[model samples]
Target chain A: TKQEKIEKTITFVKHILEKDASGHDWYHIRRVHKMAISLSEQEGGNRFIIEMAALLHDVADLNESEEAGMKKVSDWLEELHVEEEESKHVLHIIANMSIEGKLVQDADRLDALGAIGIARTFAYGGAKGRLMYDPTIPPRDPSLNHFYEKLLKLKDLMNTNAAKQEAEVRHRYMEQFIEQFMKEWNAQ
Target chain B: TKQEKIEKTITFVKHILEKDASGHDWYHIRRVHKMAISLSEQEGGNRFIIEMAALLHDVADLNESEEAGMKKVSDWLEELHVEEEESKHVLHIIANMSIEGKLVQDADRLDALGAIGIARTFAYGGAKGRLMYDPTIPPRDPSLNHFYEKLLKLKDLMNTNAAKQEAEVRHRYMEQFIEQFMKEWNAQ
Candidate 1:
């Protein structure tokens, strides 16, 4: 059954992501999965494609580079005896397009905003030897840079109206967050 | 003369702490320095002692472990030609005791709350290879455990009424943060 295959994919991907400390762990996948499902419910997409792509998207991105990890994902689906068209759909959407990609990407970006976004940004930054914040540095830390360059822009980047609505709320949350952060940083 | 020595100590500590990605960078020292002075304005402490101690406190704890770092701090002060009693006061307060120590520690703890605290917590945890959050795990990640085991308790642990009042505000901030974090985590 497709459900059985999804469960197996979860078990397989769980092993690969379990030790990640960079906020790309299995739990990250789980949340994206939940969000992708929630998004699909509203936006209308193939449930199976959305679920599989959400589960495998980070694995594909994190395993190697994009091309190499995509190959690995392709091979994994092949080995699982996933129907060829279904496997192509999974891989296609893991990369983007066909609605699942947009849903998964939005879910992933959703995780990269709000309080969770703040956590992951700092965590990812710290793992890569980036400072949290440096008032005197003037240029600011990369973790903070991430907000303006990417996280802040995610609201407008959402492909679906459903995601855009949620993204707007989370986007505003990050704005309030930065304001409070500056207030605290300046000791005001 | 004391101000000159404090500036020199800043140069010394800054060089050692500049590259740290574990949330104990020079800017952390700067904030602690500011907060310590802020605390002193209300709590009544020797200004020089509080300022110097705040700048050097993380260096002592982070250098080599408490005893070895204390030796290093002691030696550095000696090399700076600080008066013997002044040097002793610096070392003593860094280890604990004196109004300077209480003020410095409170300032440090204050930095461990609110939005900046959230940044540092996740950053530190990430550097140490801890997950941001793991909903499936009953025990939770160290980053989340950090809130319960230490960060949450810092308000009560503050030494002066001045700090406690500020600590309460920051403590409430953390409580709100954790609530939002869980709400987002559970996909609610």
Candidate 2:
């Protein structure tokens, strides 16, 4: 029943994120789900809780409708007849969403790193009709600036050692990538 | 006069591609334009022709009509009173396209290499609602197959030593990114 419930949630969540183009789609959730499970193996957490949170985490990312998202995720759990305490735990993780929610959150964040992260970032930008890089030069192109503002810093902000360690690897990957991108960008 | 003509085309083309999300937008043109100029510097070509061809190459990429796109480019060129021969070259490059149009083509193809290439591929997939790596697994996806057939083939087909050398670095970058992406996707 647990696995079946997950399968159902997978179907439901897929429907919810069916058209999401910003890399918050079902594939992203799947990556987060798998990554969180790996993190859980080392750091320890309720598997069901972690997977559930990962599966539904971005439901609210639909236009930042957090309250609407909370209700939708809650109702979906109820339909599955998920037990109260576990559902409550998932709720809290979604609600406060910090260190307690670290595993899935890290999984989520990790998806935003590495080569995968690079694809997702541009996908998100493309989805928003944003330019890949501003061509006007000497301005350092705000897209890369957005990198310094958020992506490059995600490594230091990881909540768990599992995530941080993984983050370090991916962070360096990104660093290497950024360096190459900048060099290509400024290539004389 | 040539510089002002290029500047006007840039503005007009930017407006044309203002909302494109499939990696064929204005920014793509800008990268290709700058890149073609660099190639032209070392590789030898008419700068105005190379740059103008690069800027207008994707005028038909819109969901908007192709004939309409052609007419728009033609009208713009007429408005600029571009010399007939140079204008003919730009139109021919866009119409037929390829190696003899070498510098611009190489510049455009280069945009599809390295980290930039990786992002563009996924942005393209996202824009089309296609799964990113599915083509790899089933070997059925046209897009990935196209990437291999066309994109990976670009480095060897370069027309100039400068373009070829630049292609080598970005080519290696794509190779590295693809290897990592595949490894991560296939990871246990």
| Native contacts recovered by model 1 | 0.73
Question: Model 1, which residues run further than 4 Å from truth?
Answer: A1-24, A46-49, A56-92, A97-101, A135-141, B1-25, B45-49, B52-92, B97-101, B135-141
lDDT of 1 by residue, B84-185 (tens): 777788887777626778888888878878888888889898899988765554442668777876678778888888889988988898888888888888
Clashing pairs in 1: none
lDDT assessment of candidate 2: 0.72
C-alpha lDDT values of all predictions: 0.79, 0.72
| Docking quality level of the chain pair in candidate 2 | acceptable
Q: Pick the candidate with the highest DockQ.
A: 1
- What is candidate 1's local distance difference test score? 0.79
Residues A8-84, candidate 1, lDDT per residue (tens digit)? Answer: 99988877665563435666678789888889999988888889889888777747755888888899998788788
- Output the TM-score of candidate 1: 0.74
- Tens-place lDDT per residue, model 2, A1-188, is 88898888888877755456443355557877888888888898788888788877777555355587787788879999988878988866776544448888788777777776676666666556555565563332334445666788888778888898988888898788877876666543
Number of residue pairs clashing in candidate 1, backbone atoms closer than 3 angstroms, sequence gap of 3 or more or interchain: 0
iRMS (Å) per candidate = 1.3, 2.6
